[PDB]
Amino acid sequence: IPEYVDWRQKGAVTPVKNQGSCGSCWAFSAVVTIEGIIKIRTGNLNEYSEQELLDCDRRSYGCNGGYPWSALQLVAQYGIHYRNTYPYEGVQRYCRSREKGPYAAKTDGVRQVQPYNEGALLYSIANQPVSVVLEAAGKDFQLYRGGIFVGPCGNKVDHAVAAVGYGPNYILIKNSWGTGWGENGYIRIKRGTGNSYGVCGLYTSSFYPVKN
Numbered sequence: 584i585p586e587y588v589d590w591r592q593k594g595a596v597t598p599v600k601n602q603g604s605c606g607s608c609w610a611f612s613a614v615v616t617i618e619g620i621i622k623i624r625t626g627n628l629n630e631y632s633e634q635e636l637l638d639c640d641r642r643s644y645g646c647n648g649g650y651p652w653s654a655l656q657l658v659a660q661y662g663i664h665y666r667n668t669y670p671y672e673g674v675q676r677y678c679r680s681r682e683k684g685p686y687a688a689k690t691d692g693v694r695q696v697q698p699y700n701e702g703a704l705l706y707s708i709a710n711q712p713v714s715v716v717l718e719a720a721g722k723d724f725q726l727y728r729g730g731i732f733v734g735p736c737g738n739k740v741d742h743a744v745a746a747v748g749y750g751p752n753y754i755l756i757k758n759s760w761g762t763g764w765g766e767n768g769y770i771r772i773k774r775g776t777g778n779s780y781g782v783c784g785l786y787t788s789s790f791y792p793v794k795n
């Protein structure tokens with residue numbers, strides 16, 4: 584696999600979003616990976632609905648948190664609507680998938696990256712954007728402005744984001760805190776430290792969609 588990956592340069596990443604106060608990171612994270620694999624497989628970059636996952640993933644807890652895995656499983660079982668059809672409201676409401684017509688996109692399954700394994704995660708990122716989790720509660724992460732982030736941070740993961748690239752010393756992360764945070768909404772997190780957890784627990788739980 585190459586020394587640099589950046590799915591933005593391939594036209595596979597939509598603009599940075601702001602989840603707001605709602606605990607919907609898990610849905611934002613999943614949607615990044617759907618937007619990416621549909622571009623890779625079909626050639627078209629579309630925005631898909633975080634709100635649909637927020638409302639409709641019965642295994643998750645709406646704005647009280649959730650699971651990227653079960654959100655990705657939902658898209659493989661049923662599908663997902665365009666963001667324009669089902670825009671983001673920042674609050675969980677009733678599932679409205681059936682009222683909004685046929686699904687826009689569908690995937691075929693979900694896979695987990697082998698946890699606590701840096702190379703396995705890089706391999707997956709070389710193939711497509713990946714849903715990953717990290718510990719975002721620390722002030723250092725909250726206040727991040729730029730550069731390759733080394734912490735300080737623990738491994739008590741609490742925030743789902745998306746890995747959309749990497750380089751020799753970092754993994755490139757699309758966050759859902761708006762374009763004013765970090766590097767126009769992104770953070771480069773240090774890699775190669777030899778800690779099996781990853782910096783900020785980044786290797787704890789990573790999933791990606793499968794699309795034939």
Ligand SMILES: *[C@@H](C(=O)O)[C@H](O)C(=O)N[C@@H](CC(C)C)C(=O)NCCCCNC(N)=[NH2+]
Pocket residue numbers: 602605606607608609643644647648649650651716717740741742743
């Ligand atoms: C993430 C965010 O919006 O910043 C959000 O808090 C979240 O989904 N957290 C997850 C954990 C990360 C993905 C590692 C979470 O807590 N998931 C479990 C379900 C939510 C907690 N339980 C209940 N009953 N609400």
